[model samples]
Target: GAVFKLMKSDFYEREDMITLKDIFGTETLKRSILFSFQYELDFLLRQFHQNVENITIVGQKGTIMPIEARAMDATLAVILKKVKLIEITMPPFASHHTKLIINFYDNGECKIFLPSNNFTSMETNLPQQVCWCSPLLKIGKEGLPVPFKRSLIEYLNSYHLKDIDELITKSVEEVNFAPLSELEFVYSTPSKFQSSGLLSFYNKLEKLSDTAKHYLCQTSSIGTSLSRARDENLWTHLMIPLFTGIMSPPILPTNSLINEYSQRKIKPYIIFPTEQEFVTSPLKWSSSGWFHFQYLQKKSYYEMLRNKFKVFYKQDPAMVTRRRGTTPANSKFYMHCATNSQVFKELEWCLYTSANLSQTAWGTVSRKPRNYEAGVLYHSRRLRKVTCRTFTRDPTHVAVPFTLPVIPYDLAEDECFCL
Candidate 1:
């Protein structure tokens, strides 16, 4: 299986790249289902015109949704009329937050996109989010559903979603899927999921996984915007299980008084964002309200954010920074990446799943019917080395922060992650 991380800016297409729509022609997204907690009409406007002819949105049924608001905005022509939107009535205070894109092309080809982000501009540009996509595969007359596709089809059927259901059936008959590998699909319901994929994945973590040197989590909200997204239950559900993998807790030599461990022992080094980082965020003071809700009043929640604080942002050049080249935007990154200096992705197993630091997304580990989430896991047998191309300070471009040590979170081509 291949791994893909979402570009903070562009949601559709890429550079030095080939798009499914281009190869398969405009019929690529003609018949497609887009599953997300929210949707941005702007994202689909030009997209649907060029790549996709028409689309179906299986979205969260909520009293209020940002996408809904924007789509209904009278000032913006006929954005709402262009696409079909279906709302899923979920448990109260719960949301249909799964993000997936299945595009069926005229050439009997299918493509799947699973991103850890919503379609909103804030999420698309500001925050760091991960995305995974399968290479377009062709379906011959004789084809069968892979476990992943089968389970996904089953879940869509369970929803009784008219368009999505129809789409799934069409995909099975028209497009073929290769046998699933490297990744497993996990889901959640309102109740009764003791052995569900969401919780079961932790079992796959290395027995000694906890010794990670740095923990990187970048979700858009902690427990604020996504109320149930962050809560104490998650610690018991997610983090606690891997607790035994570490020999010593993260010992930050400076101002490390959180105890944050088995009493007087040690803890793990975790990295997120600090208030100062947000102050310098692309949105600047304009997003004061967002900060107020996501951080300010929720100080304790952020410190514990599952947790979210003291942020440092940098990925490889391949982990390119997008958006405020601003034809579109500049948003915070809601990506989740954790690595210890010792734990290497080259030899050790690496996970590429969608469980967030949020409880609603990943759910608690127990029999708690939690929010549904999923991702793939893969490891490289060969070592990947990274080299950096440094630059002198320039006001017009991205400059590396002095506090940041120049290591990359992701590895690329020859020697790019710079280990």
Candidate 2:
């Protein structure tokens, strides 16, 4: 079974625990790769040193490594003709979001990392991101550690990453997946003909508590705009009832639900950033006007959900970022937290994943093969903190988050949300 471990960034540091650096520095590796969406050319070199042959660092194409973000050893390797930095264009409206660290050793052993680090920044000083790793599994007379030869190899082959295919051909079949020991791996690949795990995603939520009484959803982007007409006004609608796969029984009304309640008992809650907070923030709007994207108008949506759906914003404290409009709730999960879900009499069961809860991410009802997403399930695990950490006994782990007022509350004009 999977051990459900964590890998929070330095900003969330409490007690000193091992980090990706500590792990990468080990194994006397022969070759290594740091394939990430956001990375510093030099910052990466700091984590690698032992062996320097055929190194690959994959990051998003068009993603510039600002002058201030470059490094020395990483450059030295390229000069030595050892490390190769590869950039690939991602799928349209899609991203190269996977965080993988593959290490190949002389003994023909391999290891991999699946991390949920909340992109590059925005830390609430708790277990904000997670990392599940596989130990060095060597090819022996015994064959592969797990019997996933057929499916896994096929996935890699179709991934269109030829270099990665060559880099991991051996390790693909050599590594042992330590995390799957107890938990299962639910990967969301971009597929149009097949049903993405989203069906199961909605199914899991329906089964979370014989139908959720009130949902606690926290995401970064809300995806495409959702709308409806009420009181003769065209209002944007945002809720789970839009999920087509959720047709198990009584449906959640389009008022608490609509004609059907899915037999649900309580109002749904969502945690997100408000428009007022963004427009008037001190650090102010992005100079490029990029922040305006995936635009979520307050009156267009929030006004409708909070009173009509009982929706809530993440406590103001979870608004920690380096600048204003910088911290978007691009999370992807609906769990118990300050709610009344049966998972735990006191908020339980969470599926921490890499979804932004937008139509682009999950697609609207009746849409197929939405953007791909990946996640894992948990029991008694809750999103207790806004930066999105779990509830642990350690004092160092606890960071209080507060719910926002019905009307979006802007940070004091002079004070904007910053790290």
Candidate 3:
């Protein structure tokens, strides 16, 4: 009998890279450092060319201004020379000690800021000590859109002053008075000002899954958007199903009988009012590698059997039957939930299936399978290894500050889908 296992949690580790300096000595180290510096400068320049646009900067009184400020100004001037509308927003208060939240929103959005010690050429160039920086993207229930919109509005309302000192003061006050900690918190935590944080996070994930599912349903042309599509349709038609569902005897006919008797086939149709699709294909059989079923027990097998058959059979009295044959040769199955969430795809896991639907199948089936007959799926093991390395050892991008009391953000109401 085959056993099935879903990776609930993932383990990540980083890999180490050896530099020429490490292999060589001080001489090479100096040369390499200089080369690296030049390379970084050039890279930054190229990145600026491709990415930086509509730059907004706020710095403290004594902070060393970016050496590239002039260059950036020139670049922006050139870009803006094409001519169009430009919008600049400033906060209510500005002070020397105020946090300068620099948000870069172009193809994608990223937030950066100077240290409390103040921005300096040395800080940007040579980092000897650890400094705290915040990401403009909020993960709380309010998510990124709310805080981002608020900031944009406030900044738009801001006015420019001729006096550098007064402008500095206002900008500083804007940073200082702005809700730094409030914006930093995650959706799981409680908020003094907003109750939507936690809800927002989950809601965002749900929306992400829903959006991906919608796209799959529409683009794949799997079934009527209002009705559920058969599992077979999902696997054969849709490239990826948005979600997966399990069948148990109470809800489905026994697999053995369904496979053997053509007339006793499990209907590929999905439960209505529940926007899920059924997928069936040979890919499901190949998804599970040998490691998926290393250890097999009768109890778990029975549990699996019960779940698969119980789905459609629960409402029908005629579907009840005793466990007939010992588990089939390959009894285990898996489904990949469709989603467009960056984090979901980043982690390489399905997020559409939750405990609620599994607990109560009475509601619309929220999940769908990717194929028919095939139960297991396979992803490139090498790609998995690469992702593991990228996220684990060399996670400079992922090492941003993790806020406390994480709460979810609500994207449905906000209509803010960019994650």
Candidate 4:
């Protein structure tokens, strides 16, 4: 389906939710290469099948903390028995937020997975996350790289890890890309590129008519701060160009460009949890410190976007009928819809990724993206139809993290999580 599926959480009883074991567990598992921003090594070790011969884990060096922080050195010695660990040193103030997993089996098949959550116990069990699984690709005669394979190789080369890159490069060379022809791989690296960032990849989307009037952004965090001047705010500087599908290596917005976006009457909506929503969640704010936006409210520009902010709740009949417990969202999703109905039946496009609402995740006006990010996009034209599904086995419908007809934010009581 080339669709992103919502990963099942242990705290809820969801019939349609998929789990880590469902994707990774198998008697034929020969090897696995995993990447993320953080990980709970001991906890993640148990998720794999025992038949897996060798494992390679790549992540930031600082986040591999043990249960007892003092036993860091000793813990690594134990983990090295079954795993070949690799540490990444990102540019200053940057993070390795790319969550990808490559699996190889004895049956001569390969699969790729891109997930929204880091490999940690709390993130896997409490918060909502989504994953895109490539169909089981069989080995075929080697040939030139396809568009999907080419983009993936470019991203892997950005890491500058010879061993990891060589392994993935040789592995993908043998597999057939016929099943993944329709999927597009969009990513951001820590550099300035002539043709990079969200705006560059969305060139194809610009051809669609201007029927969709609303932009709904639901993210784990918004790393950009609010500015006093209207021109300097994120909406005017970057978000407009991204949604409008302009040239990349972003340019300074002109008066005509800004006015054109306004004339379209396009609305920007931010889906974040309210103070009450966090307080009543199963894990509360303790485990969900990742969703941050409190500092923006202190500035004058806060008044401009505050009305666009919305609260998240499970209002869909399919969602409410299956689960009674509440959970704060950790997944990141972006959607463009014709109307904010009960369920989005007329969506123009949607994105599922590990990226947050930040310049690092997307890019800055200078066209330099500061973090490692990856995601997949689904355009109405690329697929037969675009619709939202809530925890169901509907191949045609995209799995949405929050319910539709989003509720408005309570300005009086709603507060963003400071952490």
Instruction: List the candidates' TM-scores in order.
Output: 0.61, 0.64, 0.21, 0.84
Worst lDDT run of 10 residues, candidate 2, spans 393-402
2 against 4, candidate with superior TM-score: 4
Full-model lDDT, candidate 4: 0.66
Per-residue lDDT tens digits for candidate 4, residues 192-244, read 53344565555545644355477777887765553334424454445755666
Candidate that scores best on lDDT = 4
Residues 280-377 of candidate 3 have per-residue lDDT tens digits of 21122221221111112223332232233221110111221111100011111111222331322232221111111110111122222111010011
Candidate order by lDDT, highest to lowest? Answer: 4, 2, 1, 3
Alpha carbon lDDT of residue 208, candidate 2? 42
Misplaced by over 4 Å in model 1 are 1-28, 50-53, 62-82, 128-130, 141-147, 157-163, 169-174, 191-198, 204-216, 224-270, 285-355, 367-370, 379-419
Question: Model 3: residues >4 Å from true position, as ranges?
Answer: 1-47, 60-95, 108-117, 125-419
Model 3, residue 255: distance off in Å is 78
Candidate 1 residues 1-419, lDDT tens each?
34353353343323322232232235344556677766765554434434454466777765224344535444334434546677767776566656777776767677777665566656654444445667675666545446556556555665665765665556655555563433445554453523444344455443224433333332333333323443332332234324334222221311232333334332232223333333444554332333212445545543452333222233222222332211111122111123442222222333344444455555544444445444444332211221111111111101111112323312122110110
Q: What does the lDDT read for residue 33 in candidate 1?
A: 69
State residue 255's C-alpha deviation in candidate 4, in Å.
11
Each prediction's number of clashing residue pairs: 30, 24, 83, 0
- Report, for every candidate in turn, its global Cα lDDT versus the true structure: 0.42, 0.45, 0.22, 0.66
